[PDB]
């Protein structure tokens, strides 16, 4: 019996920041006065783009006050325009407590949609930039063994350029900046750039601006206290193609960007995805630990190599990673196995939820029972299917589980 997935309107994006739809304004090998101060980097990234235009709503938020989102973006541009006149650019920028920001900061079954599988496919892909250093992975006090080192070097070469690794580092930066601001500027509506850093194929260091968040008041006495925030994120994705994906956003058109393409230079609109959101201390601490996704999925790989080494009474690291008993790789390559394991780990983090917890545990129990039944030939379903409500990541993993059943 396959799991019964819920009927209803398509599910919508619920991640803390854009994934496949993000857009970056970037600067190469930066060397301005104050390189490495987020606000300074953001302004320089902002100053590389000249296609800004009078913004307007193109996909209104059905349940929100759309003029306040518009006003909120215009305030960001205006207050950055002010900073450009203050001869000493401040280290941080606290927004005026305008009515639009006071509103935005707080003073149902859903069916599976195709976009979540597309997000996952996108997370498995390679990018043309590296997002981590060679020795990023691991925490060991002592120097590591030769074998462990070999395994780490092989794995890193496969995932350093991976999109899921960008999501890790993007998530790590934004959660660190937000948690630090929640502490250092409790009463301020601080402007917090969304930044990442990477190294191009040619070795050039590069700094990336995805957009901005503004945080609300944050007197976070405990781990579950919530700080509100507004996110404002660049994108080339036209929201009118998949509006169900964007139920929680107000989307603006804010510029036009000139692009290289397969058909030569082309001009495409630049959008700004705006929503209100919230997070807590404990979620921000987990966001800061997303590099553990790299360690956890390496350990799944090492688990596999250690099994092959136990059978062949010999270390199989080179044989495993160079693909040289197994006669192929189901995902196509060892590299794609690494990136797929990583993407599952990262999405478990980006889409963490009680629904995911229940589905994970309960579907595992049903798995083993189905395996043992195969190899040798209700109730648990209620536990599994009770978790299938509206979360895109859970619904996709259920769709995946159902394929595992037909085969
Ligand atoms: Cl930094 C900034 C770069 C561009 C800005 C702008 C755009 N429209 N009005 C002001 S502020």
From Swiss-Prot:
GO terms for cellular component: host cell cytoplasm; host cell nucleus. It is an enzyme of class 3 (hydrolase). Binds 2 manganese ions per subunit. Its main location: host cell. It is found in: Host cytoplasm; Host nucleus. Its EC number is 3.1.-.-. The keyword Methyltransferase does not apply. One of its GO terms (biological process) is protein import into nucleus. GO terms for molecular function: endonuclease activity; metal ion binding; RNA binding; RNA polymerase activity. Phosphorylated on serines and threonines by host kinases, including human casein kinase II. Keywords: Cap snatching, Endonuclease, Eukaryotic host gene expression shutoff by virus, Eukaryotic host transcription shutoff by virus, Host cytoplasm, Host gene expression shutoff by virus, Host nucleus, Host-virus interaction, Hydrolase, Inhibition of host RNA polymerase II by virus, Manganese, Metal-binding, Nuclease, Phosphoprotein. Its cofactor is Mn(2+). It comes from the Viruses. Belongs to the influenza viruses PA family. Influenza RNA polymerase is composed of three subunits: PB1, PB2 and PA. Interacts (via C-terminus) with PB1 (via N-terminus). Plays an essential role in viral RNA transcription and replication by forming the heterotrimeric polymerase complex together with PB1 and PB2 subunits. The complex transcribes viral mRNAs by using a unique mechanism called cap-snatching. It consists in the hijacking and cleavage of host capped pre-mRNAs. These short capped RNAs are then used as primers for viral mRNAs. The PB2 subunit is responsible for the binding of the 5' cap of cellular pre-mRNAs which are subsequently cleaved after 10-13 nucleotides by the PA subunit that carries the endonuclease activity. This is Polymerase acidic protein. It comes from Influenza A virus (strain A/Wilson-Smith/1933 H1N1) (Influenza A virus (strain A/WS/1933 H1N1)). The chain holds residues 266 to 713 of 716 of the full protein.
């Amino acid at each position: 019996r396959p799991l019964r997935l819920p009927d209803g309107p398509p599910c919508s994006q619920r991640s803390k920041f854009l994934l496949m739809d993000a857009l970056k304004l970037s600067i190469e090998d930066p060397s301005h006065e104050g390189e490495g101060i987020p606000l300074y980097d953001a302004i320089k990234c902002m100053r590389t783009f000249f296609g800004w235009k009078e913004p307007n709503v193109v996909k209104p938020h059905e349940k929100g006050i759309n003029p306040n989102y518009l006003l909120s973006w215009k305030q960001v541009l205006a207050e950055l325009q002010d900073i450009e006149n203050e001869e000493k650019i401040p280290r941080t920028k606290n927004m005026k407590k305008t009515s639009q920001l006071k509103w935005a900061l707080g003073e149902e079954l859903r069916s599976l949609a195709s976009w979540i599988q597309n997000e996952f496919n996108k997370a498995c892909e390679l990018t043309d930039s590296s997002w981590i250093e060679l020795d990023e992975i691991g925490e060991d006090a002592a120097p590591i063994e030769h074998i462990a080192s070999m395994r780490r070097n092989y794995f890193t070469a496969e995932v350093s350029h991976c999109r899921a690794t960008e999501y890790i580092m993007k998530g790590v930066y934004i959660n660190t900046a937000l948690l630090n601001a929640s502490c250092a500027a409790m009463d301020d509506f601080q402007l917090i750039p969304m930044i990442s850093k990477c190294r191009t194929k040619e070795g050039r260091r590069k700094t990336n601006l995805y957009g901005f968040i503004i945080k609300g008041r944050s007197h976070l006495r405990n781990d579950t206290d919530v700080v509100n925030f507004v996110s404002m994120e660049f994108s080339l994705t036209d929201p009118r193609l998949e509006p169900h994906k964007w139920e929680k956003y107000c989307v603006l058109e804010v510029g036009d960007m000139l692009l290289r393409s397969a058909i030569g230079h082309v001009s495409r609109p630049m959008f700004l995805y705006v929503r209100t959101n919230g997070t807590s201390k404990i979620k921000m601490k987990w966001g800061m630990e997303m590099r553990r996704c790299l360690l956890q999925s390496l350990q799944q790989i090492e688990s596999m190599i250690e099994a092959e080494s136990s059978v062949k009474e010999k270390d199989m690291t080179k044989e495993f990673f160079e693909n040289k008993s197994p006669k192929g790789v189901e995902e196509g390559s060892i590299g794609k196995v690494c990136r797929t394991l990583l993407a599952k780990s990262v999405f478990n983090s980006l889409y963490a939820s009680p629904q995911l917890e229940g589905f994970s545990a309960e579907s595992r129990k049903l798995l083993l029972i189905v395996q043992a039944l195969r190899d040798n030939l209700g109730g648990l379903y209620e536990a599994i299917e009770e978790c299938l409500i509206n979360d895109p990541w859970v619904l996709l993993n259920a769709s995946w589980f159902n394929s595992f059943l037909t085969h």
